[PDB]
C-alpha cells in the first residue's frame, strides 16, 4: 500500500530474463536492476528472492508469492507455504480420545440481493433532443427488451429476499425474563433503544458497510435506483422472529407449531444429536455457558475492530456503483463522430450529413447499454445462486441441526443464529470442537469365556491395567459389563481380540 511504502517490483510476464533488459515505457530503472529473478510467469525485477516458507501475501504465480518484510524494509519474493508439517502416530492398537471440549461460534457472510436499477433509454441515449428521439425509432425494440430484463432482475431481487428471510409464518417474540439456561443472548436479541429495533451485532454490521454528489449526477442521466420492497425494519423483524423461535422452541417451530422447551434441555438434545451423552451438559453447563458468552464477546470485538470480513457484501455495493459510473462516463466518448454533444452536431451541420455523425453516437451508446444489461444479468444470476444457498443454510441450520460436514461451521454443528446485513445475511454458527487429546491402547473385542464381546456404542480402551469402554467423542471410562456389550461368535475369528473379564450385574443380585 501507498500508506505503508513506495517500493515497487515489476513483473514482465512471459519474458525470459536474458531478453528484457528501445522500450515503450519511458522508465527503465526497474529493467536493469540487480535483483533480477526468473519465475515461470516471467521476469521479476526489484524483489530479492528469499527461500523461506511464508503464506501467500501478494500472489505472483507458479507457486511464487511476494511480500514486504524487514529483511531494512524491502520487497521479497518466495515460494508459498502450504502449511505446517504433521505426522499422525498411527499404530495397530493406539487410539486418541479427547478428554475436553470447546464451543466455537464462527461467522459466515452471504450476499442475498443487489441494487435494483432502472434505465431510461431516451434520456440516456439522446437527452432532451427531439430529432434523435425520432431517429431512435428506426432501431426496433431494443429498449423494450432492455427494460424487460431490468424489470426481471428487479423482481428477482425481492424474490431472493422474500425466499431467504420469510421462512417463518408467525412473528414470535421472547418473554421478558431473559434467563435462557445461563446463556447470554443480549447481543443478538433486538434492542428497543434504537428507533429501528436491531441488535448490537446487527448495528455493527450495518455500520461496517459504506452503503450509499454521484447519485444526483447519475439521476440526471436517466439512471435511477428503485427502493426494495422489504425495508430493513421488516428484515430485522424476520430475524427477530427466527431468533425467538429458535431460542424458545428449538427445531420444533420449523416442522409446525412452536413447542416450548427449556434451553438447557434443548441444548442437551443438541449434544445428544452429535454422539455425546446428555449428562455431559448437565455436568458442565456453567462452563458451556461461559464459553458461549466468551465466543459472543470475541465476535463483538472482532466486528468492532476489523471491518475487512464484510467485503463479500461490499463488492455488492461496489459492483453496482462502478458499473453505473462507467455508464455515465461513456457519454463523453465520440465513437468516431465530431463531438460527444448532439446539439453541437445539430447546430453545426445540416440534416443531410448530421445524421451520419449522430448514428455513430446512437450505435455506441446502444452497445454500451446492452453491455451493461448483459453484465447485470450475469451478476444477477450469481446473486441468485448465492441467495439459494443462503435460504438453504437458513432452512437446514437455523431451523434444525445439520449433520453435513463443514456445511455450518467447522466442527460438529449445534446451533445457528441469523442476522441481517446490508444486501445480505450473517450466520453465527455455534459448533462443538474436541480439545484435549489423550493416548490409549484399544482393541476390537474382548474374550470373556471363549466368546467375543463387542461394544454397543463406544470404544474399548485401556489405561495400562484395566479395560474400559468410553464414548467416541468424550473420555468417560466405565466398567465393561454385559449391558453395554453384545456377544457374537467365538474368539478364533477377530484379529486383535484380547482377554478380559466382562462383569455380570445379575450375579451380585443373587448374593442378597
Ligand X SMILES: *[C@@H]1O[C@H](CO)[C@@H](O[C@@H]2O[C@H](CO)[C@@H](O)[C@H](O)[C@H]2NC(C)=O)[C@H](O)[C@H]1NC(C)=O
Ligand Y SMILES: *[C@@H]1O[C@H](CO)[C@@H](O)[C@H](O)[C@H]1NC(C)=O
Ligand Z SMILES: *[C@@H]1O[C@H](CO)[C@@H](O[C@@H]2O[C@H](CO)[C@@H](O[C@@H]3O[C@H](CO)[C@@H](O)[C@H](O)[C@@H]3O)[C@H](O)[C@H]2NC(C)=O)[C@H](O)[C@H]1NC(C)=O
Ligand U SMILES: *[C@@H]1O[C@H](CO)[C@@H](O[C@@H]2O[C@H](CO)[C@@H](O[C@@H]3O[C@H](CO[C@H]4O[C@H](CO)[C@@H](O)[C@H](O)[C@@H]4O)[C@@H](O)[C@H](O[C@H]4O[C@H](CO)[C@@H](O)[C@H](O)[C@@H]4O)[C@@H]3O)[C@H](O)[C@H]2NC(C)=O)[C@H](O)[C@H]1NC(C)=O
- Of residues 32-71, which lie at the interface with ligand Y (CB under 6 A)? 51
87 belongs to the binding site for ligand Y (CB under 6 A): no
Tell which residue, 135, 139, 129, has the closest CA to residue 347: 129
Tell which residue, 216, 200, 219, has the closest CA to residue 208: 200
Kindly give, in sequence order, each residue whose CB lies less than 8 Å from that of residue 19, ignoring residues fewer than 6 positions away. none
Pick out residues in 220-259 that bind its own copies (CB under 8 A): none
Overall residue count recorded for the chain in this entry: 512
Which listed residue (3, 72, 87, 347) binds ligand Z by CB under 6 A? 87
493 binds, among other proteins, ligand U, ligand X, none (CB under 5 to 8 A by kind): other proteins
Pairing of strands 36-38, 58-61: unpaired
51 binds, among other proteins, ligand Y, ligand X, none (CB under 5 to 8 A by kind): ligand Y
Rounded Cα distance, 487 and 490, in Å: 9
Report the residue number, 21 or 175, with the smaller CB distance to other proteins.
Answer: 21
Minimum distance, C-beta of residue 419 to ligand Z, in the bound complex (Å): 15
508 binds, among ligand U, ligand Y, ligand X, none (CB under 5 to 8 A by kind): none
- By three-state DSSP, how is residue 394 classified? helix
Rounded Cα distance, 324 and 371, in Å: 12
Report the residue number, 18 or 512, with the smaller CB distance to ligand X.
Answer: 18
Pick out residues in 418-477 that bind ligand Y (CB under 6 A): 463-466
Beta strands in 227-315 (DSSP E): none
18 belongs to the binding site for ligand X (CB under 6 A): yes
Whether 346 contacts 128, CB under 8 Å: no
137 belongs to the binding site for other proteins (CB under 8 A): no
496 belongs to the binding site for other proteins (CB under 8 A): yes
- By three-state DSSP, how is residue 68 classified? strand
347 binds, among ligand X, its own copies, other proteins, none (CB under 5 to 8 A by kind): other proteins
How is residue 173 written as a grid cell?
417474540
377 belongs to the binding site for other proteins (CB under 8 A): yes
Pick out residues in 382-421 that bind its own copies (CB under 8 A): 382, 385, 395-396, 399-400, 402-407
99 belongs to the binding site for other proteins (CB under 8 A): no
Pick out residues in 36-55 that bind other proteins (CB under 8 A): 40-42
Whether 206 contacts 313, CB under 8 Å: no
Report the residue number, 42 or 424, with the smaller CB distance to ligand X.
Answer: 42
Minimum distance, C-beta of residue 447 to ligand U, in the bound complex (Å): 6
Which listed residue (5, 13, 16, 93) binds ligand X by CB under 6 A? 16
**DSSP string spanning 107-130?**
EEEEE----EEEE-HHHHHT-S-H
Whether 318 contacts 298, CB under 8 Å: no
How is residue 73 written as a grid cell?
524494509
**DSSP string spanning 144-204?**
HHHHHHHHHHHHHHHHHHHHHH---SS-----S---BTTB--TTTS--TTSSS---HHHHH
Other C-beta atoms closer than 10 Å to the C-beta of 249 total: 17
464 binds, among ligand Y, ligand U, ligand X, none (CB under 5 to 8 A by kind): ligand Y
Report the residue number, 2 or 465, with the smaller CB distance to ligand X.
Answer: 2
3 belongs to the binding site for ligand X (CB under 6 A): yes
Kindly give, in sequence order, each residue whose CB lies less than 8 Å from that of residue 177, ignoring residues fewer than 6 positions away. none
123 belongs to the binding site for other proteins (CB under 8 A): yes
Q: Which residues in this chain contact ligand U in the complex, by CB under 6 A?
A: 100, 102, 287, 290-291, 435-436, 447, 499
454 binds, among ligand Z, other proteins, ligand Y, none (CB under 5 to 8 A by kind): other proteins
Pairing of strands 459-462, 437-442: antiparallel
- Which residue stretch of 18-26, 41-49, 117-125, 180-188 sits at the interface with ligand Z (rule: CB under 6 A)? 180-188
86 binds, among ligand X, other proteins, ligand U, none (CB under 5 to 8 A by kind): other proteins
Pick out residues in 255-314 that bind ligand Y (CB under 6 A): none
User: How far from 178 is each of 183, 186, 297, CA to CA, in Å?
Assistant: 9, 8, 18
Report the residue number, 127 or 409, with the smaller CB distance to its own copies.
Answer: 409
Whether 211 contacts 422, CB under 8 Å: yes
Which listed residue (187, 249, 370, 484) binds ligand Z by CB under 6 A? 187
- Which positions touch ligand Y (CB under 6 A)? 51, 91-92, 463-466
Amino acid at each position: 500500500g501507498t500508506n505503508t511504502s513506495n517500493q515497487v517490483a515489476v513483473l514482465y510476464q512471459g519474458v525470459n530474463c536474458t531478453e528484457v533488459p528501445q522500450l515503450t515505457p519511458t522508465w527503465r530503472v526497474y529493467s536493469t536492476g540487480s535483483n533480477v529473478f526468473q519465475t515461470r510467469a516471467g521476469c521479476l525485477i526489484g524483489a530479492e528472492y528469499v527461500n523461506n516458507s511464508y503464506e501467500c501475501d501478494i500472489p505472483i504465480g507458479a507457486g511464487i508469492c511476494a511480500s514486504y518484510q524487514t529483511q531494512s524494509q524491502s520487497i521479497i519474493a518466495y515460494t508459498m507455504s502450504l502449511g505446517a508439517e504433521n505426522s499422525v502416530a498411527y499404530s495397530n492398537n493406539s487410539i486418541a480420545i479427547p478428554t475436553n471440549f470447546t464451543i466455537s461460534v464462527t461467522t459466515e457472510i452471504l450476499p442475498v440481493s443487489m441494487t435494483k436499477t432502472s434505465v431510461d433509454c431516451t434520456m440516456y441515449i439522446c437527452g432532451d433532443s427531439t430529432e434523435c428521439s425520432n431517429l431512435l425509432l428506426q432501431y426496433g425494440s431494443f429498449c423494450t427488451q432492455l427494460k424487460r430484463a431490468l424489470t426481471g432482475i428487479a423482481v428477482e431481487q425481492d424474490k431472493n429476499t422474500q425466499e431467504v428471510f420469510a421462512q417463518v409464518k408467525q412473528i414470535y417474540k421472547t418473554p421478558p425474563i431473559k434467563y435462557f439456561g445461563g446463556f447470554n443472548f443480549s447481543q443478538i436479541l433486538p434492542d428497543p433503544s434504537k428507533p429501528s429495533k436491531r441488535s448490537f451485532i446487527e448495528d455493527l454490521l450495518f455500520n461496517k458497510v459504506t452503503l450509499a454528489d454521484l447519485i444526483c449526477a447519475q439521476k440526471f442521466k436517466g439512471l435511477t435506483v428503485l427502493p426494495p420492497l422489504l425495508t430493513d425494519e421488516m428484515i430485522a423483524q424476520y430475524t427477530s422472529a427466527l431468533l425467538a423461535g429458535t431460542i424458545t422452541s428449538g427445531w420444533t417451530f420449523g416442522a409446525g407449531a412452536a413447542l416450548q422447551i427449556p434451553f438447557a434441555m434443548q441444548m442437551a438434545y443438541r449434544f445428544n444429536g452429535i454422539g455425546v451423552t446428555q449428562n455431559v451438559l448437565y455436568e458442565n453447563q456453567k462452563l458451556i455457558a461461559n464459553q458461549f458468552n466468551s465466543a459472543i464477546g470475541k465476535i463483538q470485538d472482532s466486528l468492532s475492530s476489523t471491518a475487512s470480513a464484510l467485503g463479500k457484501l461490499q463488492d455488492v455495493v461496489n459492483h453496482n456503483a462502478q458499473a453505473l459510473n462507467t455508464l455515465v462516463k461513456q457519454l463523453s466518448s465520440k465513437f468516431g463522430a465530431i463531438s460527444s454533444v448532439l446539439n453541437d452536431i445539430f447546430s453545426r451541420l445540416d440534416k443531410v450529413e448530421a445524421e451520419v455523425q449522430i448514428d455513430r453516437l446512437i450505435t455506441g451508446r446502444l452497445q454500451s447499454l446492452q453491455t451493461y444489461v448483459t453484465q447485470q444479468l450475469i451478476r444477477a444470476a450469481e446473486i441468485r445462486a448465492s441467495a439459494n444457498l443462503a435460504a438453504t443454510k437458513m432452512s437446514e441450520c437455523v431451523l434444525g441441526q445439520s449433520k453435513r460436514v463443514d456445511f455450518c461451521g467447522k466442527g460438529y454443528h449445534l446451533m445457528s443464529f441469523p442476522q441481517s446485513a446490508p444486501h445480505g445475511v450473517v450466520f453465527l454458527h455455534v459448533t462443538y470442537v474436541p480439545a484435549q487429546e489423550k493416548n490409549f491402547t484399544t482393541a476390537p473385542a474382548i474374550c470373556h469365556d471363549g466368546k467375543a464381546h463387542f461394544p454397543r456404542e463406544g470404544v474399548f480402551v485401556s489405561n495400562g491395567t484395566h479395560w474400559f469402554v468410553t464414548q467416541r467423542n468424550f473420555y468417560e471410562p466405565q466398567i465393561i459389563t454385559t449391558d453395554n456389550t453384545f456377544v457374537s461368535g467365538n474368539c478364533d475369528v477377530v484379529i486383535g481380540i484380547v482377554n478380559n473379564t466382562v462383569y455380570d450385574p445379575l450375579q451380585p443380585e443373587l448374593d442378597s
